[PDB]
Every structure is written in structure tokens, then in C-alpha cells.
């Protein structure tokens, strides 16, 4: 504290108000631009339809082909890319199918060596990928 007086409270309150506004994490949650630019719209999960199965590549140190999918949303129609999580689950996803899309867990940031992804696939055709991986549910037709 700099202004240390007995009847100095509105100066301290206003100064801390502007210095609280002059931040990054608090300013991200108190402006509508970050929420409107977010394709989820402040939601935890989201639905969408598969357009095509793409393959993106890793970064400089490690070399692999991380296989993803291009999904366009239900609620607004934004076009995102989502990473199919586990091994060999790209057979379970076909084109023009409903998927449930969630984040990675770094609050809208790229995770690991995959560039540009912020989303991952939890369910396809209203059945979970874990049951399909473990041979517990079958894809209806």
C-alpha cells in the first residue's frame, strides 16, 4: 500500500479495481468476447456431426500421425477439429454421424504435441467409446 491515510478508501478501492481489470485470467472471464469466441459457448460438453476424418502431425521432437476428425457444431455451426482419444477408434466413427465433444482439460488450449486442437471425442452415435473399446456395446444399424 502507498496511499496510507485514515479516510483514504475510495482511492484504494478504485486503484485496486483498475489493477484488477488490468489482468489476464480475470479479464478473460469478465468480457463477453472470450465467451463469444469460444465455440462451446461456456458449456462443458457439446454435440456435433462428423464431416471428414483428417490426419494431423506432431511437433518437432516426436514424430507420429495423430488422427483427428472435423466436426461442425449443433448449436451455432462453428467448425472445429477434435482428437479421437484411444487406439484404433477411427473405425467406430463414420461420416455424417453424431458425436459428443468435450475438451482436453487445459481450458481451451492445445495439449501435447498436436497443434491447433482443443477438443476431444467422448461418445459417438450416443454410445461411449470406452464400451466400444472394451467390447461392451455394439454400434446399432
Amino acid at each position: 500500500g502507498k496511499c496510507r491515510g485514515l479516510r483514504t478508501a475510495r482511492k484504494l478501492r478504485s486503484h485496486r479495481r483498475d489493477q484488477k481489470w488490468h489482468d489476464k485470467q480475470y479479464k478473460k472471464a469478465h468480457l463477453g468476447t472470450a465467451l463469444k469466441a469460444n465455440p462451446f459457448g461456456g458449456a462443458s460438453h457439446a454435440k456435433g456431426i462428423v464431416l471428414e476424418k483428417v490426419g494431423v502431425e506432431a511437433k518437432q521432437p516426436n514424430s507420429a500421425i495423430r488422427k483427428c476428425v472435423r466436426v461442425q457444431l449443433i448449436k451455432n455451426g462453428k467448425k472445429i477439429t477434435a482428437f479421437v482419444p484411444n487406439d484404433g477408434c477411427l473405425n467406430f466413427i463414420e461420416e455424417n454421424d453424431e458425436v459428443l465433444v468435450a475438451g482436453f482439460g487445459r481450458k481451451g488450449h492445445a495439449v501435447g504435441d498436436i497443434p491447433g486442437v482443443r477438443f476431444k471425442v467422448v461418445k459417438v452415435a450416443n454410445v461411449s467409446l470406452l464400451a466400444l473399446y472394451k467390447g461392451k456395446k455394439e454400434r446399432p444399424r
Binding site: E52, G55, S63
Partner: protein, 99 residues
């Protein structure tokens, strides 16, 4: 040493223009221009030059990106052209290592 052939999903291609960022575009022998990729075993060990015969892998869900497997030298490319796995009208243009 050996003469590896194609497979049910693997084909042949010829490099057209050398590209940056560890990628290239190659002319497949079907009339389709495909953006290939350099294999991670080929990123520093061996080099790929313009207008060379290479073995290329494919994707079964899209045909926009591809990936190079191996590279053929001059004598084995001529031998495989003589066998018939390559078209006769394909110009190999005598790709070789100079001195």
C-alpha cells in the same frame, strides 16, 4: 539390395517440386497430385531429390495427404521399369548421384 513392390493401398510416385517444412508434393501414377510426407526414418538419414521414384503410402479415408516409405536408386528403378510395375511412358530422367 531388395526390390520391394507395391501393395493393396500402396503405390508409386515421382517428386515434382521440393517443398519446405519437411513435406513435398509428388505426382502419383493415377493422375492425382498428392501432398506427400517424409518418413521419420528419412528426416536426416537419406535425402529425396526432385524427379525421383519413391514408394508412397496412402490414407483409406482421404486422398489429400500421403507419406513416403522408401526411395529407389537408379539401377533398381531401371530394373523395375523393365519388369513392368512402372509405366513405360514415365520419364525417370536418369536420377543419380553425381561426383
Amino acid at each position: 539390395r531388395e526390390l520391394v513392390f507395391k501393395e493393396d493401398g500402396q503405390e508409386y510416385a515421382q517428386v515434382i517440386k521440393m517443398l519446405g517444412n519437411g513435406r513435398l508434393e509428388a505426382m502419383c501414377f493415377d493422375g492425382v497430385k498428392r501432398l506427400c510426407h517424409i518418413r521419420g526414418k528419412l528426416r536426416k538419414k537419406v535425402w529425396i531429390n526432385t524427379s525421383d521414384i519413391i514408394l508412397v503410402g496412402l490414407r483409406d479415408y482421404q486422398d489429400n495427404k500421403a507419406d513416403v516409405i522408401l526411395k529407389y536408386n537408379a539401377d533398381e528403378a531401371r530394373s523395375l521399369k523393365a519388369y513392368g510395375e512402372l509405366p513405360e511412358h514415365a520419364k525417370i530422367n536418369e536420377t543419380d548421384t553425381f561426383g
